[PDB]
Amino acid sequence: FACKTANGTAIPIGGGSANVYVNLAPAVNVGQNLVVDLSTQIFCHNDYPETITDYVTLQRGSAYGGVLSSFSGTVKYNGSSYPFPTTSETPRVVYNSRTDKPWPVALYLTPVSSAGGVAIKAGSLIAVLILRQTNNYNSDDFQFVWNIYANNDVVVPT
Ligand SMILES: CCCCCCCO[C@H]1O[C@H](CO)[C@@H](O)[C@H](O)[C@@H]1O
């Protein structure tokens, strides 16, 4: 089991870390949702699917910077919604093919009532998402750590 970003940065068997650099919608009002669909950015596959089945969760999702200070969040994992920053590990998704498949994570972020000006700065860390991979074969329990960066400023008009 291994993963890569859309730009080709890999995290190999056994886990590790990578940075994800994403363009964000440039403006969001109070009462609107800013969505970041990381299923377009992070892909994984099972290396031996006719022998082993891989199980994959969002173990934890943490917010940083302007997301932490100025937004209320949910994360959708495999179509189901949970608080973000997270308060539990999600259910699992099965990876059963050598063909890369998206990691089905999207952030839904809405400004807090006192948010204003530039709320997320260009280049800043917005989230750390931990993908946890286990299987039906042995005791493997590996963390794939995705450090999510905003490419651009996001403004919240008042
Ligand atoms: C008959 C023995 C087959 C032994 C192949 C081991 C391959 O392990 C790798 O690939 C497996 C399949 O993706 C993962 O479950 C595991 O964590 C690791 O990434």
Residue numbers in the entry: 1 to 158
Published text:
The adhesin FimH at the fimbrial tip specifically binds in a catch-bond mode to terminal α-D-linked mannoses of N-linked glycans of the receptor uroplakin 1a on urinary epithelial cells. FimH is a two-domain protein, composed of an N-terminal, mannoside-binding lectin domain (FimHL) and a C-terminal pilin domain (FimHP). FimHP possesses an incomplete immunoglobulin-like fold that is completed by insertion of an N-terminal donor strand of FimG, the subsequent subunit in pilus assembly. The two-domain architecture of FimH is a prerequisite for catch-bond formation because the interactions between FimHL and FimHP determine the conformational state and ligand-binding properties of FimHL.
To test whether ligand-binding causes domain separation in FimH, we determined the co-crystal structure of the ternary complex of FimHF18·DsG with n-heptyl α-D-mannoside (HM), an established model ligand of FimH20, as well as crystal structures of the isolated FimHLF18 and FimHLK12 lectin domains in complex with HM. The isolated lectin domains (residues 1–159) of both FimH variants (FimHLK12 and FimHLF18) were produced by direct expression in the E. coli periplasm and were purified as described. Displacement of GN-FP-4 from FimHL by increasing HM concentrations under equilibrium conditions showed that both FimHLK12 and FimHLF18 bind HM with 3,300-fold higher affinity compared with the respective FimH·DsG complexes (Kd values 1.1 and 3.0 nM, respectively). In an inverse competition experiment, in which HM in preformed FimHL·HM complexes was displaced by GN-FP-4, off-rates of 2.0 × 10−4 and 3.5 × 10−4 s−1 were determined for FimHLK12 and FimHLF18, respectively, corresponding to dissociation half-lives of 58 and 33 min. On the basis of these measured off-rates and equilibrium dissociation constants, kon rates of 1.8 × 105 and 1.2 × 105 M−1 s−1 were calculated for FimHLK12 and FimHLF18, respectively. The on-rates for the isolated FimHL domains are thus 30-fold lower than those of the corresponding full-length FimH·DsG complexes. Previous ligand-binding studies on the isolated FimHL domain mimic the domain-separated Sbound state of FimH. This state is characterized by extremely low off-rates and is promoted in vivo only after ligand-binding and the onset of flow conditions.
